[PDB]
Amino acid sequence: LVLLKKAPPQGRKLLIIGTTSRKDVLQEMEMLNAFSTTIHVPNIATGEQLLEALELLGN
Amino acid sequence: FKDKERTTIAQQVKGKKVWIGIKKLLMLIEMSLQMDPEYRVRKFLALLREEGA
Numbered sequence: 001l002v003l004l005k006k007a008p009p010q011g012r013k014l015l016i017i018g019t020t021s022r023k024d025v026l027q028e029m030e031m032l033n034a035f036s037t038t039i040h041v042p043n044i045a046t047g048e049q050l051l052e053a054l055e056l057l058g059n
Numbered sequence: 060f061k062d063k064e065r066t067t068i069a070q071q072v073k074g075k076k077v078w079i080g081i082k083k084l085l086m087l088i089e090m091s092l093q094m095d096p097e098y099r100v101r102k103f104l105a106l107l108r109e110e111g112a
Contacts (some may be wrong), residue, residue, distance in 0.1 A: 036086050 004034045060088070062098050064100045 004016060020034070028033050029044060060068075087110070091103035 037090065 001031045001034050004031075060100070067100055068104060075111075079107075079111055083110075 018027065023038070024034065032038075035047065044053075087103055087106055091099055091106065094102055
């Protein structure tokens with residue numbers, strides 16, 4: 001997390017992507033604020049998305 | 060942010076209470092900036108709606 005808040009020498013630029021299956025313990029350890037933004041990825045909620053995915057795969 | 064946008068925000072801020080910090084604010088203006096001109100302020104504000112509350 002120091003690396004998330006660290007800058008390289010000027011002019012250089014990066015992005016650092018992370019993943020996890022939980023936000024809750026990470027908020028508990030106060031690393032979440034270091035992350036500039038978040039994305040909730042949703043999970044498949046609908047038979048519509050399901051069956052159209054299956055139209056795609058065609059199995 | 061041009062003066063028009065300054066005002067465009069400024070109408071509805073003063074009725075509200077702000078808890079913010081600078082180093083976040085930079086990224087806010089930035090990520091909101093990369094949209095087209097009409098969207099820019101809308102995105103900045105709308106992020107602040109949840110962020111500063």
